[PDB]
């Protein structure tokens, strides 16, 4: 896919180095449009950074900090849309990218740690925010840059905080450069001016000729002067055409504005017009893919299995909120207080962050660590939206066995813009989420678990959706001793897929099941009960069904399908005792029914409207 979503961490440190690097690589492998932010921090020396060559447009902001690699290739980058800015002031931040200036005495011929020279030959647009460059003890040429050319005329915040201190005598701009403002020493690094050398009123142009003016809806430079020839669409890119609005999906007559579906309808996703919304987002009636349904509009699963927001006539159902969703917005974790709102929540919305305080208490709030026997709140939950943080579990629980019915987690709310799970600080031994069958979006980290197996075995790929998702191993208990001890699935588990030890958890198994365990076989003729097969389920025969091995005991659950009733026949049913009949619809027992010779629950020939005291030897009321 050409569209990914970037991280959101600002200056928080990596969860792990050997995980952070691969996190970047999985997030930006072949991506061309980066929705969300773009963050590069604590990049070690000799970093690959090749996966960045094909990034063209950034929809958030660019952050680079505390780096020791000497060059970060971002040539094909063109436009920085600045949707959400760094510190609400910056859209391109490059700071501290050099040695801490403490000791770090370089040996002979050693390049000191720090970005040698910016190299961005096609970055010629910034739609908002400013530039923040400082504390770069090896950067060159950053001052000889005409930034106001890079900025956009609407970006009135043309505020730059640029520093010039350096410890190396930078080589002069190569003579081929014009204006002596060069990104680098090589001849092709001279800045291309597209905002100081255009015609009168031309925002962008190919060159200093009054026919080089770009169309009114391009971004930076143009191959041709038609709106289909932009290097980057300003507002919407509908099928290679730069338009101002995606075509509406309903036509209204000018008299009644009656809604007639328009086959040429387009939904909006980022700065692009998409015919149908992507997998995880929701299509609303107003015509925009989103994540959270608006007010008085509720999730409804469409006929084709997709989801969409539908209008409510009656008040929409009582959706059981989680955390960080609507009104528990800044609520961090679940105490014993909010947990009570989670009674009868088959579907939850929002995160459930679990800081260690949840299981270590907070004296100021008078909240004890929540009980390991306080988890019954989360038992009928079947769908969570957003992530599911975990950094405290009870030791009495050997795992996260609590959520046996959570069937769907969707990644509509990720932890840092990146993470849909997390398993860090735990001491658990497995998972046991036997019913989690879909994991919408975002990487799932399982981090710093010293007692954990069942991560090299979980059926991953069958849960993810896009190629961009990836799952990251770190500090997890070694698979080598996991196998040696034998923390894997068992034979019935199809394809070696599982979640934890014991035959309980298998996403799939060859033989049948009797409710919570894949079986070796059903008990049809041999077996303590008698069970008939249905959807590979061994439903037990009715107790009245006489267990007659050698013949099919039953053909169903009700009494009618027993091969031969054990005791008596009240046709068409099997009974252990021929019940005393009743005359009316309203309850009244005159007896009036006796078992026959072979079990036919005969009615009593005798009738006693007066309820005669004398009782026939058969049980009938004997007439006085």
């Amino acid at each position, epitope marked *: 896919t050409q569209v990914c979503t970037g991280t959101d961490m600002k200056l928080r440190l990596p969860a792990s180095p050997e995980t952070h690097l691969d996190m970047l690589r999985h997030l930006y492998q072949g991506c061309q449009v980066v929705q969300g932010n773009l963050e590069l921090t604590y990049l070690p020396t000799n970093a690959s950074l090749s996966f960045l060559q094909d990034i063209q447009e950034v929809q958030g902001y660019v952050l680079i900090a505390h780096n020791q690699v000497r060059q970060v290739p971002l040539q094909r980058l063109r436009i920085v849309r600045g949707t959400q800015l760094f510190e609400d002031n910056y859209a391109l931040a490059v700071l501290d990218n050099g040695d801490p200036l403490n000791n770090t005495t370089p040996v002979t011929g050693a390049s000191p740690g720090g970005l040698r020279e910016l190299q961005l030959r096609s970055l010629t647009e910034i739609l908002k925010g400013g530039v923040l460059i400082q504390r770069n003890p090896q950067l060159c040429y950053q001052d000889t840059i005409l930034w106001k050319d890079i900025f956009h005329k609407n970006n009135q915040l043309a505020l730059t905080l640029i520093d010039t201190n350096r410890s190396r005598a930078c080589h002069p701009c190569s003579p081929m450069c014009k204006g002596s403002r060069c990104w680098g020493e090589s001849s092709e690094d001279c800045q291309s001016l597209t905002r100081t050398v255009c015609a009168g009123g031309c925002a962008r142009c190919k060159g200093p000729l009054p026919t080089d003016c770009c169309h009114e809806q391009c971004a930076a430079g143009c191959t041709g002067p038609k709106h289909s020839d932009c290097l980057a669409c300003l507002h919407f890119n509908h099928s290679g055409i730069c338009e101002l609005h995606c075509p509406a999906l309903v036509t209204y007559n000018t008299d009644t504005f009656e809604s007639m579906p328009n086959p040429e309808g387009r939904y909006t996703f980022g700065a692009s017009c998409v015919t149908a919304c992507p997998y995880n987002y929701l299509s609303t009636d107003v015509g925009s893919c989103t994540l959270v349904c608006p007010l008085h509009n509720q999730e409804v699963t469409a006929e084709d299995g997709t989801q969409r927001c539908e209008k409510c006539s009656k008040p929409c159902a009582r959706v059981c909120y989680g955390l960080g969703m609507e009104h528990l917005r800044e609520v961090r974790a679940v105490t014993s207080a909010n947990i009570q709102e989670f009674a009868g929540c088959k579907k939850i919305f929002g995160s459930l962050a679990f800081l260690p305080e949840s299981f270590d208490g907070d004296p100021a709030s008078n909240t004890a660590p929540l009980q390991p026997e306080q988890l019954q709140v989360f038992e009928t939950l079947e769908e969570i939206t957003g992530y599911l943080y975990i950094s405290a579990w009870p030791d009495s629980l050997p795992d996260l066995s609590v959520f046996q019915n959570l069937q769907v987690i969707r990644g509509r709310i990720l932890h840092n813009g990146a993470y849909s799970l997390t398993l860090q600080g735990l001491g658990i031994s497995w998972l046991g989420l036997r019913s989690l069958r879909e994991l919408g979006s975002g990487l799932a980290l399982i981090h710093h678990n010293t007692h954990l197996c069942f991560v090299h075995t979980v059926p991953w790929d069958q849960l993810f959706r896009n190629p961009h998702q990836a799952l990251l191993h770190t500090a997890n208990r070694p698979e080598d001793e996991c196998v040696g001890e034998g923390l894997a699935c068992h034979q019935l588990c199809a394809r070696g897929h599982c979640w934890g030890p014991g035959p309980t958890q298998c996403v799939n198994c060859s033989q049948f099941l009797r409710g919570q365990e894949c079986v070796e076989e059903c008990r049809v003729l041999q077996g303590l009960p008698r069970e008939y097969v249905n959807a590979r389920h061994c439903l037990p025969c009715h107790p009245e069904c006489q267990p007659q091995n050698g013949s099919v005991t039953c053909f*169903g*659950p*009700e009494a*009618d*399908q027993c091969v031969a009733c054990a005791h008596y026949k*009240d*046709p*068409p049913f099997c009974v252990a005792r021929c*019940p*005393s*009949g*009743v005359k009316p*619809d309203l309850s009244y027992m005159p007896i*009036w*029914k006796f078992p026959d010779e072979e079990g*036919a*629950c*005969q*009615p009593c*020939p005798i009738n006693c409207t007066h309820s005669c005291v004398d009782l026939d030897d058969k049980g009938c009321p004997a007439e006085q």
Partner: antibody
Amino acid sequence: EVQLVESGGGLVQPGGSLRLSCAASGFNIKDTYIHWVRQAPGKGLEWVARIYPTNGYTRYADSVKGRFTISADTSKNTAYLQMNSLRAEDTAVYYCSRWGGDGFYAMDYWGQGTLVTVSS
Amino acid sequence: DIQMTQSPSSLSASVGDRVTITCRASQDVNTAVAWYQQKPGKAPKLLIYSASFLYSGVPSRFSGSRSGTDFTLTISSLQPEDFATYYCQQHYTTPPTFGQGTKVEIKR
């Protein structure tokens, strides 16, 4: 009094789907049976489906099996027969019938009948 | 499946006659057979249950006799109301089985 209200009869098209609703009054549906029976025009009647609403057990005749579906709601104290992939021969008078709970399995109380006509 | 072969549906008789309807099961059926009366365009009703017991609201002129697998619905005295389709339904198996109806008209 024990009354059965049958609704949903009307014209239908071949290949379509219809639903019949049987509402019970004067008695609780929680301790009896329900039987949907066709009355074929010009032919003898024909038992179609049985449902036990206490546990919602469903049994269908072989012929109508695969297409028809049944359900019941004890709280609403009624039953529904959702018929799918209607055929031309399905044109008949559908009836909802009850049973005597225990010691009595006669169709003591019948519904009124709703016509289903499939002729395009 | 158990088959019910009914008496021929041609039983034109006048009032007061003893009218007999023959019902025969394909297999053994015990007494699990009940006669239901249904005038066309209406709903049937239990006219005789368990093959031997009259139901409440039924005149005593109606009767039912059992002999092996042969059931005889007997009317001592014919009445104008005794004109409908009569089904000797059996419940002896899971799908209750009916007959072809004995259209009991009136010889007039």
